[PDB]
């Protein structure tokens, strides 16, 4: 009934030293029934990464929508969109559906190509921007993620250390949620290289 | 000349040529006569045929139980205007339980025709109408012109050669107005009036069309052998 | 330029008068009404011998009790026929009865003057609407693009109309049989047609109370043509 | 309607769909084909609310057939599935949404690969090795999770499908009157007339 | 209760005649068969007005088709005009259960079940209405493809009678139609009050009732 | 909206815009249609003023409306796409509602109806296109060939040509086509269609396109070499 | 759809030999609060019609304006506005009846019960009712709200059927109406002592009486009533 | 009324020509020449900027070559403002197709769509047509490398090599002379520049008077790269081919 | 909440004879337990020898009758003063009713007259337009009290011929206008006794080839 918890899933993002990390589980279900263990929730448009939790049809729809908009942005502007600008675009796009919203919990992550400054941001289903320094959480196990991140996180972590922190934050939070898990992916992002790692986790 | 391309253009002398050309279509139409007394109102119309195989074009249209008209000019325009009257007569009945006054019926026709003379794209109506009726203030006869001008009269005639019938009625004014409680004599006067507009042809059984409305007489049309009595 | 709904100084609508000229260029169509039925006949007028003449549909069914023949810009007639068929069927739906031929004709003629700046110009086609109803019996109407319709005992429209109408003037009487009318349409068509009349370049049809509207077979018309030739050679 | 299954093997996609059409307390038909051929190498099975299912399927069919004629070209299964998803995703926020769940089984002639897509009425698309809609998956996914291997032969796929239908016939309360099975491969679409 | 089934000699259509408003019997003389044309029949179940209105409307659409196309409309096309129409009104509260039955050269004898939910089904046998289950019992146990027009007509008559007896919202009388290659043929109105005692005596059935 | 009456009558009872649309058809490349006993062939001229053309991707002159019906044309190329699109949509709509593909006559009647509508609608000009519509009705082995024109009139033809120098090829077809015995085979029908185009075309190289339509959705377009063999055989018999 | 706020109670009326009588108190209630004590709910139209309105007062004021506008509109291009083509009671009623039923059909009614009382051109008595549902009926006696339950019974004792109308004089009819108004004051919790009464006679025309009061009331017997059963003091 | 002032943009001449289309084509014949050449391993787009100035900022300037998506590009000849209206529409159409089918739009489908829009302005609406002719250079996995052209009439055709704008008659003759089917991109680059160098109305062909682009599978493995040449890169290729 | 519907009570009855037809109805109009009018005509002459009554919610009933009378007027205008046959009127009323299928005229409509062969005809409608020609039909409040009586006394249901004991039915002999009026009066007298919404007066409209005649009878006023 509650659209935000039919399919289930989670996303978490963190900042480190000259790097950002964004991660998500791979589960897609119909309430109790697990349907797919390859439903990725992180997408990217150039060097800007977007994670989306919530109702899966809207996750897919928005991805297609932001691909549409960022492709036109690039043709006209003759440059790739930046995280700060994309964040405003996501907010604008969501609020235009104020009284008929997409049931999602987006999370933007990336590094500004000009300033080199790491950037993360979260939103509610209708566009409110949460621009945190430390971390952003989203999904059915957001409470769990808040508790993991708030205790595990420390500022200025190196890429390979940040990987361990965000991976353990996601994994242990998902294991306390019935509608999350079934695999996980972690993106480690630096100014001009991105590494994608699939995590080994319990499949129940 | 340069000012007759559309209805939205006055001429340098203040004339509306498209309206005047619409008025010309009436003069080409077949003659029809209207006249009334204090009790009854009568329409007499000379119907026109295409040839000997064809029927004679109907000239008279019923609008309500107490009102109707005769036409001269573009028949389809008379159908549009008579349909409008039918609706207005009907609106008055359904909403106010009130038979539409003949004078008010004329005012509505005037205003409908007027809109077509002041706007771009449209055209004036190409027909003249003679409306007869019996309402709360007795018998009535109206003459409608597509310029918008509507005129209440004792008697009149419109169409080709209508001047002959109109002069006759102008002489007979004092006589036919007094024909009260005698429908057949009032029709006779109308048949005699329309006869002053005939040349070459005469009134035959499928040529003549008569209508009447009065105190205790609903608007009824007489055609065929029903008018042989008056030939 | 000038308005589409403009009156001429004589009090006629330019466009309506010009559409009448297009109808004069059309192929001949003849209708004859009798007490045994109404006959409708048309000149097909194929532009080339390779054109399959049976595909030329200038006579058309509106309902079981109403038929229609056309002359002029025949493409314009299609929407008029569609309206006529819809009006005929719709009335049956609303009133559980056949529609009067005059009322059908009136409904078609209401479209005529719905042009301005609605459609952009009048229809360039005249129709002969023939049918039967219980009230007024067998009827033939001539529907023009002016919105005017006259009832006729007999009528010819198209390129050979005034010559055919003069011939119908002499030949028609109130006691004609259906067979006599059929031959009469064939006779007058043969007179005004450029090419020699046969079953392939001319088409007959009739409407009777019993059998309704029927388009004649080429075999049936061919016999009536042969019957015509013999009776003309008989004196 | 009720049960629709799909399984993608080595060189083909197999769709199984129940034959029953129950309208209340009566089984009206026991030979209903709950599928439409969208293109020569693409088949879509469907299940949901009465009327909406067929109306939607035939609407999709018409659109794909229109595309085929216009371009003289067959769309890939992936392209067709994306078109279908968008229609359902559009539909879910309509005045009256299409209440239809579908499986799209196609053979991509360009890549020489079978492809199975599961899409629900919300417009939720997933590519799968095997899929189901409604209560079917609750019984069948455990068997498939167990006996399925990606290099299976069409005959092995049919045997595994029989195992699924047998389990459904044993444990499901509703009598779905067996299934119509259809295979989609490089040579096109064909129906297994004995199952 | 209304049924229709395909067989060797074409189609049999049989319906009851009762109409109710709650427990109140509004009419026992209802015409639940619609003669769309000389080859098409329409059965009516559910809302009286909805069925009547839209099936006579269907006949107007079928007539317009054969005027435009100079050819008899197919049973498939006729049924789909009705199903597409009611589908536009889906949710508004129409209540219809109908069988569109007919014969054409290209199709042969054909029956389509059309429904206010938008359901359109082709099939050999259909029973629709509150007493459909009672009619199905008799039909399924006695149906064959090789039935004589006489025997098929009786089976349809008997299957309605079965439902008229048990179903409280069915009864009145039985209307029979037989659809062939040359069109449909009406086979009379049969009052259940007389038919029941006749069948009971001749057939030896209905031994639970006393007469 | 733009409501201007562009197609209107003139004093002599002519609609000049419709007649000028025919002049656009007269300018268009020649198209020919010939129906045999069990087939219809559509021949089309390709003007050789345009070389360096990519014949793979260039819009072909003959277009499939459905799997069993085809449409060729003469006149404005851009205008033809609009009619073809509408026709293709109507073909799928007919299948969807009637559960049966369109008859060749029905599809023609639709396309002709669209063309007519553009001759008495405000703000639009007529289509500068005449079409040849050919195919076989569903479950029918009788060949069908229809023609349409800007005015909206349509009719069936045993054989017909449209476009530039169509007067000449119609002259040829009128003396060479026998109704009592039409081209009995595919070969004879294609040969007669190529012969008719050779009266007008110039070179028999890439200037002639041929498309053969047979019953039961059997439509194929002949290649350059296949057509070139007909061109070779025709002239070798002519040298006598 | 709304709910009535400021309301008017019973409107009572009856026919007599030469015309009709209509009456209605001058109160505008706001629920149980008797908020407005000077409200005129009888609205004359010309010199031959009186429209009595109960129910929502804001809607009454709207209807009052429609009628005022109706008179204005009827005078336009009408030389016989004060003669043969003057507004009749039957015209005014049918107009209101049309409006009432149209408004109910849009699910936005005028929350009223109206009685149009008047005399026609030919001297015939006119008395007809219409309400928020567009329901119409005529009778020798008509009353709204509580008047339907208490006034009609009393007025029907005077004119029980059509044949009793010529036998009923204006003095007898007015007496019955005034008595009915007293009874309603005794028994309607939303009535006032002050009321207006209108007579439309075919001979003497329209007589409109304002500031009438209920008088000759019986209360003395109240002194003898003690307790609710057993109490003696 | 207003009829008096109506030019009637969508009518036939007595000869059966569309006045406004013919006059729009006359307008385009004065525009800077644009050339497209298709090779087996890529496509070349070359175009001449019209009588420029020394004070024009060339590196940020774009009047001829535009990007529709990553696979398709266009060369413009005519009114630049008109072209940008259509270009933005085309860009949107490609994105709509990508969103619907999750595949890049086939070149012809995009070309047909724009050509249909142009057609509409010649048949209805009473508006003037777009005074623009395009050369479409694109790639998809069905037909591979494709060259098309569209003009104000809305008619489009496919080409191996083609020119639009000024001196197309002279340009098309020169292309027809030196073009061969087994030609490669580097050879096509040379042919394009040589053709412009001979057909130009200017005294000499220089880097500041040119826009240049290539669509190559010369991208690392099975994929396509668009290259809009920079002013310095156009200057280098002019020296390489031996024109300056 | 606003309830756009109401119940004005009443009861109507149509009986088709061999060459005549009657349409009767009581003259009482009510709401809840109050009488609005003891004489409020419910059955109307609509012209063309057709009589009509729309029983139930009077506002919808008056609206429908008014609209049908209007349809008769326009039928004359549009079709050359042709007489509207009873079968054609019935079909026209179906379309009037079904035109408001999703906001119905809350009425049970009955019309009576003569068919085109001169025989008596009665047509019955439900609120949403379903209709059927009948020999006998009561409508409204006390329809359930009257119809069984009419099944018995007009169609001779459950009646057999003495001596045969259930074997031979009572033959369906035709009824005269005087016989029908007796059955109508007894039907309304009986309905008045046991139904509180029925009483005051009975008005009957009789239709023959000669035209439409009226008869009025008193009913109990309690
Ligand atoms: Mg689990
Ligand atoms: Mg029972
Ligand atoms: Mg009582």
């Amino acid at each position: 009934s509650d659209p935000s918890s039919i399919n289930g899933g989670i996303v978490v993002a963190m900042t480190g030293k000259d790097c950002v990390a964004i991660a998500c589980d791979l589960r897609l279900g119909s309430q109790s029934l697990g349907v797919s263990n390859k439903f990725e929730k992180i997408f990217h448009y150039g060097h800007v990464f977007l994670g989306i939790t919530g109702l899966a049809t809207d996750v897919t729809t928005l991805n297609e929508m932001f691909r549409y908009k960022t492709n036109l942005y690039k043709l006209k502007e003759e440059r790739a969109i930046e995280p700060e600008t994309f964040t405003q675009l996501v907010s604008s796009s969501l609020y235009e559906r104020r009284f008929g919203p997409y049931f999602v919990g987006p999370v933007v992550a990336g590094i500004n190509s000009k300033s080199g400054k790491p950037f993360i941001a979260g939103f509610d289903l209708i566009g409110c921007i949460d621009e945190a320094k430390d971390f952003i959480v989203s999904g059915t196990a957001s409470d769990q993620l808040f508790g993991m991140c708030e205790s595990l996180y420390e500022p200025n972590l190196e890429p390979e250390d940040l990987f361990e922190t965000i991976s353990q934050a996601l994994l242990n939070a998902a294991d306390r949620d019935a509608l999350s898990g079934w695999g996980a992916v972690v993106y480690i992002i630096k100014k001009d290289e991105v590494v994608k790692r699939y995590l080994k986790m319990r499949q129940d | 000349n340069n000012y007759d391309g559309d209805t939205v253009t006055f001429s340098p002398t203040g004339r509306l040529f498209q309206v005047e050309y619409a008025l010309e279509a009436i003069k080409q139409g077949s003659v029809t006569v209207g006249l009334r007394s204090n009790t009854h109102a009568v329409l007499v119309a000379l119907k026109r045929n295409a040839d000997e195989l064809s029927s004679y074009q109907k000239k008279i249209i019923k609008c309500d139980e107490h009102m109707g008209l005769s036409l001269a000019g573009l028949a389809p325009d008379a159908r549009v205007l008579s349909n409008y009257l039918r609706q207005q007569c009907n609106y008055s009945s359904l909403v106010f339980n009130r038979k539409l006054a003949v004078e008010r019926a004329g005012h509505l026709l005037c205003d409908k025709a007027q809109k077509n003379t002041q706007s771009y794209g449209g055209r004036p109506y190409g027909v003249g109408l003679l409306i007869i009726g019996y309402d709360k203030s007795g018998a009535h006869l109206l003459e409608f012109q597509p310029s918008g001008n509507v005129t209440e009269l004792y008697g009149t005639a419109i169409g080709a050669r209508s001047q002959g019938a109109k002069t006759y009625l102008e002489r007979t004014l004092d006589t036919f107005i007094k024909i009260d409680g005698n429908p057949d004599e009032l029709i006779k006067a109308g048949v005699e009036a329309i006869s002053q507009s005939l040349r070459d042809e005469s009134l035959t059984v499928d040529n003549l069309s008569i209508a009447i409305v009065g105190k205790d007489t609903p608007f009824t049309i007489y055609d065929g052998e029903a008018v042989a009595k008056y030939i | 330029d000038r308005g589409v709904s403009t009156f001429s100084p004589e009090g006629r609508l330019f466009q309506v008068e010009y559409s009448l000229e297009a109808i004069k260029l059309g192929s001949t169509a003849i209708g004859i009404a009798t007490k045994e039925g109404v006959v409708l006949g048309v000149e097909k007028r194929a532009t080339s011998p390779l054109l399959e003449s049976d595909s030329i549909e200038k006579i058309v069914e509106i309902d079981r009790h109403i038929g229609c023949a056309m002359s002029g810009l025949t493409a314009d007639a299609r929407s008029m026929i569609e309206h006529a068929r819809t009006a005929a069927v719709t009335h049956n739906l609303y009133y559980d009865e056949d529609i009067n031929v005059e009322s059908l004709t009136q409904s078609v003629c209401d479209l005529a003057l719905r042009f301005g700046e609605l459609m952009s110009r009048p229809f360039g086609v005249a129709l002969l609407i023939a049918g039967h109803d219980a009230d007024d019996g067998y009827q033939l109407f001539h529907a023009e693009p002016s919105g005017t319709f006259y009832r006729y005992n007999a009528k010819a429209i198209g390129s050979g109309s005034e010559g055919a109408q003069a011939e119908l003037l002499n030949e028609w009487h109130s006691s004609l049989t259906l067979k006599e009318a059929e031959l009469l349409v064939l006779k007058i068509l043969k007179q005004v047609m450029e090419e020699k009349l046969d079953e392939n370049n001319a088409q007959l049809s009739c409407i009777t109370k019993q059998d309704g509207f029927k388009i004649y077979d080429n075999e049936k018309t061919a016999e009536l043509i042969k019957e015509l030739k013999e009776k003309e050679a008989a004196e | 309607m009720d049960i629709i299954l799909g399984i993608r093997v080595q060189d083909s996609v197999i769709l199984a769909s129940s034959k029953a059409v129950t309208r209340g307390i009566s089984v009206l038909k026991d030979s209903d084909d709950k599928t439409r051929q969208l293109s020569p190498h693409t088949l879509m099975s469907f299940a949901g609310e009465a009327g909406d299912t067929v109306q939607f399927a035939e609407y999709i069919q018409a659109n794909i057939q229109l595309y085929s004629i216009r371009e003289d070209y067959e769309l890939s299964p992936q392209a067709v599935s994306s078109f279908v998803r968008q229609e359902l995703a559009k539909s879910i926020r309509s005045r009256r949404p299409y209440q239809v769940n579908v499986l799209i089984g196609g053979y991509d002639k360009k890549k020489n690969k079978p492809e199975l897509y599961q899409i629900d009425y919300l417009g939720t698309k997933v590519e799968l090795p095997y899929g189901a809609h409604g209560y079917s998956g609750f019984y069948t996914f455990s068997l498939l999770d167990h006996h399925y291997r990606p290099d299976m032969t069409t005959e092995e796929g049919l045997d595994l499908l029989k195992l699924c239908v047998q389990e459904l016939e044993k444990r499901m309360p509703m009598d779905f009157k067996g299934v119509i099975v259809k295979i989609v491969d490089k040579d096109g679409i064909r129906q297994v007339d004995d199952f | 209760t209304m049924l229709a089934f395909r067989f060797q000699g074409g189609i049999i259509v049989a319906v009851d005649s009762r109409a109710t408003a709650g427990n109140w019997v509004a009419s026992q003389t209802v015409k639940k068969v619609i003669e769309i044309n000389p080859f098409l029949l329409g059965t009516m179940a559910g809302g009286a007005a909805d069925c009547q209105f839209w099936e006579t409307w269907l006949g107007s659409q079928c007539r317009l088709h054969e005027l435009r196309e100079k050819e008899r409309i197919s049973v498939a096309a006729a049924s789909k005009i009705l199903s597409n129409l009611v589908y536009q009104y889906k949710g508004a509260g129409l209540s219809m259960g109908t069988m569109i039955c007919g014969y054409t050269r290209k199709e042969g004898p054909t029956i389509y079940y059309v429904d206010s939910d938008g359901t359109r089904l082709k099939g050999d046998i259909f029973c629709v209405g509150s007493g459909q289950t009672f009619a199905y019992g008799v039909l399924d146990s006695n149906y064959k493809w090789d039935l004589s027009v006489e025997d098929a007509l009786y089976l349809g008559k008997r299957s309605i009678l079965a439902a008229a007896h048990r179903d409280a919202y069915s009864g009145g009388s039985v209307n029979l139609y037989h659809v062939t290659e040359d069109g449909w043929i009406y086979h009379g109105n049969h009052d259940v009050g007389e038919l029941f005692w006749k069948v009971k005596e001749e057939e030896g059935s209905f031994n639970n009732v006393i007469g | 909206g733009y409501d201007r009456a562009l197609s209107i009558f003139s004093p002599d009872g002519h609609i000049f815009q419709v007649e000028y649309a025919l002049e656009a058809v007269k300018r268009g490349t020649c198209a020919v249609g010939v129906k045999g006993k069990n087939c219809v062939v559509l021949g089309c001229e390709r003007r050789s003023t345009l070389k360096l053309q990519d014949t793979r991707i260039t819009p072909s002159k003959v277009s499939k409306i459905d799997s069993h019906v085809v449409l060729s044309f003469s006149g404005l190329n851009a205008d033809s796409r609009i009619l073809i699109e509408k026709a293709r949509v109507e073909a799928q709509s007919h299948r969807l509602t009637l559960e049966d593909p369109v008859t060749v006559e029905y599809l023609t009647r639709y396309v002709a109806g669209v063309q007519q509508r553009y001759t008495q609608s405000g703000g639009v000009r007529p289509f500068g296109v005449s079409t040849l519509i050919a195919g076989f009705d569903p479950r029918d082995d009788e060949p069908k060939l229809y023609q349409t024109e800007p005015s909206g009139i349509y009719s069936s033809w045993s054989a017909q040509t449209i476009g530039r120098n169509s007067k000449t090829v119609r002259e040829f077809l009128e003396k060479n086509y026998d109704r009592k015995e039409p081209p009995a085979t595919v070969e004879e029908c294609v040969k007669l269609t190529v012969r008719s185009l050779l009266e007008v075309v110039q070179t028999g190289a890439k200037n002639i396109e041929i498309t053969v339509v047979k019953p039961d959705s059997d439509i194929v377009a002949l290649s350059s070499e296949e057509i070139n063999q007909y061109v070779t055989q025709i002239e070798q018999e002519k040298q006598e | 759809t709304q709910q009535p706020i400021v309301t008017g109670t019973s409107v009572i009326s009856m026919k007599y030999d030469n015309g009709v009588i209509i009456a209605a108190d001058n109160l505008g209630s706001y629920g149980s609060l008797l908020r407005f004590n000077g409200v005129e709910r009888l609205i004359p139209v010309g010199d031959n019609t009186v429209v009595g309105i109960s129910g929502d007062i804001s809607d009454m004021q709207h209807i009052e304006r429609l009628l005022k506008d109706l008179v204005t509109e009827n005078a336009y291009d009408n030389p016989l506005a004060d003669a043969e083509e003057a507004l009749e009671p039957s015209y005014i009623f049918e107009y209101l009846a049309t409006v009432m039923y149209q408004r109910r059909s849009k699910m936005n009614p005028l929350w009223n019960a109206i009685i149009v009382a008047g005399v026609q051109s030919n001297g015939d008595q006119f008395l007809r009712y219409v309400n928020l549902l567009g329901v119409t009926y005529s009778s020798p006696t008509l009353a709204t709200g509580f008047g339907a339950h208490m006034a009609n019974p009393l007025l029907r004792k005077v004119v029980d059927r059509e044949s009793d109308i010529p036998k009923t004089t204006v003095q007898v009819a007015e007496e019955a109406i005034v008595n009915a108004m007293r009874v309603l004051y005794y028994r309607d919790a939303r009535s006032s002592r002050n009321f207006s009464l209108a007579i439309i006679d075919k001979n003497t025309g329209l007589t409109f009486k304002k500031n009438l009061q209920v008088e000759n009331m019986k209360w003395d017997f109240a002194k003898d009533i003690k307790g609710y059963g057993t109490q003696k003091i | 009324g207003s009829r008096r002032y109506d030019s009637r943009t969508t009518i036939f001449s007595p000869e059966g020509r569309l006045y406004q289309v013919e006059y729009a084509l006359e307008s385009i014949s004065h525009a800077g020449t644009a050339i497209g050449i298709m090779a087996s391993d890529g496509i070349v787009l070359a175009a001449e900027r019209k009588v420029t100035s020394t004070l024009l900022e060339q590196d940020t300037s774009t009047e001829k070559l535009y990007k529709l998506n990553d696979k398709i590009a266009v060369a413009v000849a005519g009114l630049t403002a008109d072209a940008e209206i259509l270009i933005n529409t085309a860009r949107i159409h490609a994105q709509n197709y990508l969103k619907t089918y999750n595949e890049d739009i086939p070149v012809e489908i995009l070309v047909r769509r724009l050509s249909d829009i142009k057609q509409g302005y010649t048949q209805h609406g009473g508006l003037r047509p777009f005074g623009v002719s395009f050369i479409y250079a694109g790639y998809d996995d069905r037909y591979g490398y494709q060259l098309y052209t569209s003009n104000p009439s809305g008619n489009y055709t496919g080409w191996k090599a083609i020119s639009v704008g000024a001196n197309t008659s002279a340009a098309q003759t020169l292309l027809q002379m030196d073009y061969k089917d087994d030609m490669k991109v580097d050879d096509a680059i040379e042919l394009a520049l040589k053709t412009l160098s001979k057909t130009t109305d200017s005294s000499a062909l220089t880097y500041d008077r040119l826009e240049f682009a290539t669509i190559r599978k010369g991208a690392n493995d099975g994929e396509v790269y668009q290259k809009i040449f920079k002013p310095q890169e156009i200057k280098d290729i002019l020296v390489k081919t031996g024109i300056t | 909440q606003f309830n756009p519907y109401g119940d004005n009570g009443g009861t109507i009855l149509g009986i088709a004879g061999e060459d005549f037809a009657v349409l009767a109805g009581d003259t009482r109009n009510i709401t809840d337990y109050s009488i609005n009018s003891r004489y409020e005509p419910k059955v109307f002459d609509c012209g063309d020898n057709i009589v009509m009554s729309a029983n139930g919610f009077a506002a919808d009933g008056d609206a429908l009758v008014k609209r049908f009378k209007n349809s008769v007027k326009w039928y004359h205008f549009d079709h050359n003063d042709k007489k509207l046959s009873i079968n054609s009127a019935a079909r026209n009323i179906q379309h009037l009713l079904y035109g408001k299928r999703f906001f119905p005229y809350y009425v049970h409509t009955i019309i009576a007259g003569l068919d085109e062969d001169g025989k008596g005809a009665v047509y019955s409608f439900d609120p949403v337009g379903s209709y059927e020609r009948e020999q006998c039909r009561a409508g409204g409040a006390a329809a359930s009290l009257i119809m069984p009586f009419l099944d018995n006394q007009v169609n001779f249901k459950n009646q057999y011929e003495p001596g045969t004991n259930g074997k031979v039915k009572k033959p369906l002999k035709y009824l005269s206008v005087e016989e029908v009026i007796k059955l109508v009066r007894d039907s309304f007298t009986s309905a008045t006794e046991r139904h509180i919404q029925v009483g005051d007066g009975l008005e009957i409209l009789i239709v023959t080839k000669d035209g439409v005649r009226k008869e009025f009878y008193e009913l109990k006023r309690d």
Side-chain angles (χ1 to χ4, degrees), chain E residues 154 157-158 161 190-206 211:
Chain E
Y154 180 78
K157 198 211 296 184
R158 182 63 182 79
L161 180 59
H190 308 268
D191 194 355
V192 178
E194 296 151 31
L195 181 65
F196 181 85
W197 298 119
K198 174 181 156 76
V199 170
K200 179 181 162 58
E201 191 172 28
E202 294 177 14
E203 207 172 46
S205 58
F206 290 115

Side-chain angles (χ1 to χ4, degrees), chain E residues 18 163-170:
Chain E
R18 186 165 293 186
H165 183 49
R166 289 283 180 174
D167 183 24
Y169 302 118
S170 291

